Design a protein around this nucleic acid. Structure first.
Ligand code: NA
Ligand code: NA
Lengths: 373, 373
DNA sequence: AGGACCC
DNA sequence: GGGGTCCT
DNA sequence: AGGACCC
DNA sequence: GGGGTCCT
């Protein structure tokens, strides 16, 4: 095809941003978002005062006694604002992929190439970068790949400027030749900045990481599997025998993560579009012995229907999740034709409790609607 | 919507038909199709001489010593002829669903309704059935549902007449208001006949069955589960407490098979279209201790590529199946980007053997290509 | 239905 | 924690 | 990846 | 047996 321009948009302390927009009084006072017993995220007034992400409410409070907390267990508003962002990006180029509520990849390739056609011979000398260039590296205006990347940073800026002007949201962007590198670079300067990774700087970025667990793709379990063999650095992953790598994780995994260590990722950006599933979870511990473990289900069921109801699309499969002591457990089933057409509570409750029994004769109850049509 | 006209086409002794077209000399001499140690299917010259489907080659031979056998382990030609049938049906109405190589449901609803508009007031008195009416039941020319069903049998005949005139194939048809009833009725008069089930005759058909295992939907395992509770007849299934039914099979299953016993099925006819997977199996026993259990894999791999190659679409997942002694086992994985683009043997062989090892440190080896794009 | 990844 | 993805 | 159904 | 489907 062959070379691509990918932007990774990533919002600053998203939920905190949403909270500060809601109550202006909270802005420039140090703000944590409290989920249950966890300060899940917090603003830079609290961040730069010692607080880290997922810090104990009591720990985070004995570090910063002035810390103000909002409860962010209902995710509704963050979800709503989450799509307002994607929709905005979809407007620059239709192919946008979400990573959770606060990140988006956008594939700028066909868009960059267009800009480069407005562009005469003389005004091609005057293409300038927007924001940071990774590792402070010299642009070469005759390197065709440097050029279409700078255009990427120009678009990324136009995206951020517009997120702010339209939704009032500040964020970070990384422009690179693939999703992996776009992601790694986007976070080099933050909170409200952007960076572009020129190709000659790829190893520099990849080796700046201190553990493989820092490569998006390698996670808690895969990391500790590699570790157990003596594979600690990115270079250890690079240099390791492809053969030993296979005989512990799959050839599926082994082929893919070795590439990732070279900064090599040719996975496409996927149009996310509407969501595949709507789900919700209440948490507790211990409790539910078992029933009203029901009443918790009813709660979730009413909440869900609302969201499922505004969508327009219909869910053909319900799911019940539990977990237990002391990985969870799920039973699903199709949703009957008559009760799909969309007092809808009473049959749905019957469905999930039968599912429930089929469980148990717990620390989590969660309902999920999926298989949308 | 609400009521439908569905035809179930079902070919007579398909493979035998294909063989007799290939060697005319075999016609009206008693013909079995030999897969391995099984006479898998046979013509009506052999059928009406005692031979049953899946009868031992030696059993089938000591019943009929004159029995002539062709080997039907390579399924290529039957598959080719299989789609020539579907393609033909797709021409009457685009929504055709295959059940294996020899059956097709076609949804005649929108097609019937059209015919009924050419049709004035006076020539509506003269609508006649084509072939058998199930249980010899009186047509009532004023029953709107009798009428659009007769049109169904007219179309079904036009389908059969055309299968024969174009592909030289004889078959059976059943017209009914759903797939279940279409299927059950199609086989009432055979080999080369058709039948239409008028709605007032539905229970009569459903109760003509002697075991639940005869309802398409209920199979070896579900049948023996119902049996174990004392549920032997269709009526036993009809009358059984919905509650006891759930606590042994799933509410998923329980809700659906109770309907089936009432002759109630509202599952749509699905456009099959192109195939989801290409696979192949060699069989043996015992043997492969383990390797050349490889060489068997290479064989299948060459055969597969051919079929996969003619398609145009590309397979993104390979699969290896084994089974063992004395349900099988599978490992799959994606197929690498570079080797997808489509010496292609050598990497593919490497893939499946790694998969193979991941097995074993058997009576079947099978490769499968799927996830087509 | 369970198990990897992202946030 | 409260959520989503896709692959087996 | 295993397990139901159809042929 | 030599094949296909979809749901968990
Ligand atoms: Na990671
Ligand atoms: Na059956």
């Amino acid at each position: 095809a062959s070379s691509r321009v990918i932007v990774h948009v990533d919002l600053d302390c998203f939920y905190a941003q949403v909270e500060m927009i809601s109550n202006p009084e909270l802005k420039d006072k140090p703000l944590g978002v409290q989920q249950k017993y966890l300060v899940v995220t917090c603003n830079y007034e609290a961040r730069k005062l010692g607080v880290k992400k997922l810090m104990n409410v009591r720990d985070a409070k004995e570090k910063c006694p002035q810390l103000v907390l909002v409860n962010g267990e209902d995710l509704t508003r963050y979800r709503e604002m989450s799509y307002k962002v994607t929709e905005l990006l979809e407007e620059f180029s239709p192919v946008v992929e979400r990573l959770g509520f606060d990140e988006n990849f956008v594939d700028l390739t066909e868009m960059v190439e267009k800009r480069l056609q407005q562009l005469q011979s003389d005004e091609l000398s005057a293409v300038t970068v927007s924001g940071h260039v990774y590792n402070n590296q010299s642009i070469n205006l005759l390197d065709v790949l440097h050029i279409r990347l700078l255009v990427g940073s120009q678009i990324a800026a136009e995206m951020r400027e517009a997120m702010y002007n339209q939704l009032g949201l500040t964020g970070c962007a990384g422009v690179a030749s693939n999703k992996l590198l776009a992601k790694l670079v986007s976070g080099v300067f933050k909170p409200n900045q952007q960076t572009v990774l020129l190709p000659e700087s790829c190893q520099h970025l990849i080796h700046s990481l201190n553990h493989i667990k820092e490569i998006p793709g390698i996670g808690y379990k895969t990391a500790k599997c590699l570790e157990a063999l003596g594979i600690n650095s990115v270079r250890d992953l690079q240099t390791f025998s492809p053969k030993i790598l296979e005989k512990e994780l799959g050839i599926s995994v082994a082929q893919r993560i070795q590439k990732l260590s070279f900064g090599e990722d040719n996975s496409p950006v996927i149009l996310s579009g509407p969501p595949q599933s709507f789900s919700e979870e209440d948490s507790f511990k211990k409790c539910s012995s078992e029933v009203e473990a029901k009443n918790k289900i009813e709660e979730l069921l009413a909440s869900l229907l609302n969201r499922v109801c505004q969508d327009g699309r219909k869910p053909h499969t319900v799911r019940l999740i539990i977990r237990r002591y002391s990985g969870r457990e799920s039973r699903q089933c199709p949703i009957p034709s008559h009760v799909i057409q969309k007092d809808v509570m009473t049959p749905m409750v019957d469905i999930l409790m039968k599912l429930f029994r089929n469980m148990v004769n717990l620390t989590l109850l969660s309902v999920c609607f999926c298989n949308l049509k």
